Symmetry: D3
Amino acid sequence: SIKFELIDVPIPQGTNVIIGQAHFIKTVEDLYEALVTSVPGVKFGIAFCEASGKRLVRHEANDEELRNLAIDLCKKIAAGHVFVIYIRNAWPINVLNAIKNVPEVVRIFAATANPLKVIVAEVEPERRGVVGVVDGHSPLGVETEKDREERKKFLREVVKYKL
Amino acid sequence: IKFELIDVPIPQGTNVIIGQAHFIKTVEDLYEALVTSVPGVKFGIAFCEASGKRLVRHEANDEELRNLAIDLCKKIAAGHVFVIYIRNAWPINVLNAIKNVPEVVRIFAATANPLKVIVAEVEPERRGVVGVVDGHSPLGVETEKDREERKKFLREVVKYKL
Amino acid sequence: SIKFELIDVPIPQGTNVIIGQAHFIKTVEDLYEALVTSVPGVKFGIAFCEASGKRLVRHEANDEELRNLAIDLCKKIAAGHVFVIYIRNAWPINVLNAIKNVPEVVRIFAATANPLKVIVAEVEPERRGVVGVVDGHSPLGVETEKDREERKKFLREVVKYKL
Amino acid sequence: IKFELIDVPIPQGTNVIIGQAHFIKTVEDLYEALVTSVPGVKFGIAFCEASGKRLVRHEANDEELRNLAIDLCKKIAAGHVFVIYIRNAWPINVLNAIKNVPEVVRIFAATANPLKVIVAEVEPERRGVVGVVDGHSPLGVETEKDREERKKFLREVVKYKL
Amino acid sequence: SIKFELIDVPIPQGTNVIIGQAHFIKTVEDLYEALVTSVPGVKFGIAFCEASGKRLVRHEANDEELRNLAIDLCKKIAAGHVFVIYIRNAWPINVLNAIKNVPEVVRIFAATANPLKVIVAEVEPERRGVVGVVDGHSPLGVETEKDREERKKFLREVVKYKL
Amino acid sequence: SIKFELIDVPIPQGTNVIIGQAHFIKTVEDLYEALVTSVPGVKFGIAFCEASGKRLVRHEANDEELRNLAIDLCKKIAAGHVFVIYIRNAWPINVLNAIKNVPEVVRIFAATANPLKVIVAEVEPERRGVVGVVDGHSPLGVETEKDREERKKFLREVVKYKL
Ligand SMILES: Nc1ncnc2c1ncn2[C@@H]1O[C@H](COP(=O)(O)O)[C@@H](O)[C@H]1O
Ligand SMILES: Nc1ncnc2c1ncn2[C@@H]1O[C@H](COP(=O)(O)O)[C@@H](O)[C@H]1O
Ligand SMILES: Nc1ncnc2c1ncn2[C@@H]1O[C@H](COP(=O)(O)O)[C@@H](O)[C@H]1O
Ligand SMILES: Nc1ncnc2c1ncn2[C@@H]1O[C@H](COP(=O)(O)O)[C@@H](O)[C@H]1O
Ligand SMILES: Nc1ncnc2c1ncn2[C@@H]1O[C@H](COP(=O)(O)O)[C@@H](O)[C@H]1O
Ligand SMILES: Nc1ncnc2c1ncn2[C@@H]1O[C@H](COP(=O)(O)O)[C@@H](O)[C@H]1O
């Protein structure tokens, strides 16, 4: 029938993870390029589950810890055509549109540094796919106007992403 | 793992857009995407902050739509989900702008059809969207006559095609 | 309550399939145009599940084989606002970014020529949605340096997509 | 090489967008870009076919704007130039859609300011656009007070920013 | 002061030319990739005027005639950071959005198979820039409604780009 | 009638400049955001020639040197709706696609760190437009196979933008 499995995603402090689905072996080189040409100091590991042929986890990196995190999560999800990116010295918003526009990339499941689970379906031996993710925690309530003011201030005075 | 079905209310004249993003700036960037797309668009946006205070963050120029968006976020109750309700605009008027907001990771639905969201709860307070049910299944396959009728609809009625 | 079903996706040799979610009847015409204006000589079929009103599988094609493959998969998936595209004489990378930018298109579940299953949830009679896909097979191992050299060679000497 | 200046009329309530494209499908694709961007947009589009019959090709849902666009194409008289006049929409509502039309190669201007097009004629019937003059040169540099005033304009008046 | 020069662009039957401006040496590889990954049968030459360093016309191609056309036009325009693409077996609409989205690419001056001139300004020795182009001929008149019907028919029955 | 002027563009070592055309006052804020959200630690100045009303050079920056460079160039070009961006700690390729997709931006004339001139037409007092630019220098020759190997090596071993 269908077996659901939960995969916990380790996210060390200072990293962000991006998980998606693509196709074709060139994914690995195109994602390498999207990352290194987006932010000069970026440190990353990228791994991609080739789904046919030799069926290898394909990987590039300029940081060995991040390479191994990416590889290990691909091994655990173990679903054809999934890719995993771990990054330091850059935020997902710095690279996401580049990633969306890689022609091999078909969808992105998560971009986050929160506690994160991946929900995987195994339908037959060695046939697995991503069902969804659980990105952080459910809401505790609704923000107030003063909470709104606070987050506006955060964006303007702290991270300076807005004026 | 438990699955839950969330019914999505869609008042006449509105459309809903449901997706997933990350980072608090989501709500400001989605506000701008909408307001700069269509003059006179009316909307409510709500976004599930998934860490820290874990507050539903919201922007709107219509209070009915604000509160619909907030309600649905609370019902779905999945981290980093956003909901947009719109009036005086169609999803096609705004969707490419939304896709290109850097915080936005994925869109699950854009529609006015009867709609359900399928949510997985894996543990208390840890939920995610596993799909949507957008309207109903097919009743059959269109004929050449049906084709001619939808071609005329797009050219004579809504005038989106020549 | 919720029933999960598995739909097998036929893929004749020489074809690729792209499956996604959209909305609005204009989907069919816009995807037609996206395909035909991308690659001279592309052969395709496109079907879309209109999810209200007449609830007809809507379709366009320049190849009858591919039309019927697209229509048949839509009948089997049977989920509102899902679209299916079968292509010959073009690869998904040749058309995907065009498809992504169609304003009706909201998400793409798969683009592939691998063995492929679609996981569909039926929540009540006539109410179905796509939960995920199973694209090819789980990984057999992790790429070695030697395997990386072979992948690089393939991209440079065989398909000539990299220099 | 001779240079000519073409004055561009801009009626109150309109904006003009001038660029360069190629291939007859330009006009249909620009029509669709506009009509699917903003409900109730009013427009005229004209495009200079630069071979074959060399006819100005045009689409519109407003006759005043159609004819303005046609007139300007004739005055510029440069192969593969297009002109769009719009009402009930702003250029920012439609420009990204226009940029992404595959026939469109470049955009010279989007504005309601007084505007001139600079055209080079190299030989009879062989002309091209060499630039535009969009409004007037700067009178000075804004102060912090001026800054605060434009920030308030964008947040309190047009509400494009928070 | 400023010297204006007119460069005539040869366009052999069955080719199209794309002329633009970019920056950075990676332009040449990224444009190669944009072209070869857009249309399977595409034949092309691409040349780019490196504007500093060794200041070479940089080039890639899978067709030697087109390579030489591209190189020769770069030599004649002789303006820093200009690029030239000649293509067969594909139309500009098949590749243009990919080209626009190459991060090195800053503008496109022309995409056409019409009689074409490039207007170049030389301001000082070996300092040249593109002022504009003359793409085909000035209009002879305004199309009628029946002319409109004819071009609609062309798009629907002949090239089949619209329905 | 028409006077042509040549504006020299100062480019301190470590900076790049991007010059373009936009419209509407929101240009300044949207370009600010495009820059700051692209690369952590980017330093920039952005100036824009408001072309009606008060006709003020509008500006935003996180670095006073770069602000004044941007403002000064706008004063010298002195053409309505032109924008200038100077950046440190980021390359144009890191930000260009974001800039291209700002809805106010209509065209980009240059992105470079080379010697650069802007050609401005003055058609009457206070009425100026950008005609073109002269980005670096004319080519000295055509790339040999040996030169191509060196270019490839540079991209793979030095800047690591290609594999
Ligand atoms: N300054 C920032 N810039 C860009 N993205 C951020 C920033 N801070 C947090 N994020 C992203 O937004 C998510 C939620 O924010 P946080 O409140 O830090 O848990 C993080 O997991 C990051 O993926
Ligand atoms: N005129 C229109 N323009 C754009 N989108 C539309 C229009 N009419 C319907 N839609 C969208 O397409 C979906 C299906 O349409 P309907 O067949 O009218 O139920 C709706 O729920 C809307 O999201
Ligand atoms: N030469 C190619 N160009 C583009 N896409 C390809 C190519 N070869 C394979 N693919 C795609 O990548 C997927 C996996 O490749 P394969 O290893 O050939 O089974 C296929 O299912 C195709 O969708
Ligand atoms: N069937 C076509 N598909 C795509 N582009 C075309 C086609 N025919 C012509 N073009 C382009 O449109 C331009 C003008 O068309 P023509 O009427 O063939 O001179 C040509 O120079 C080509 O660049
Ligand atoms: N509210 C607005 N929304 C979008 N664009 C605008 C708006 N107001 C003015 N513009 C554009 O910006 C240009 C400069 O504005 P103004 O200062 O009002 O002359 C105009 O010619 C319009 O093209
Ligand atoms: N490492 C790099 N990454 C990105 N862009 C660069 C890099 N090096 C040079 N550039 C850009 O390409 C242009 C020409 O390069 P150069 O050969 O270094 O003078 C410069 O003016 C920069 O704008």
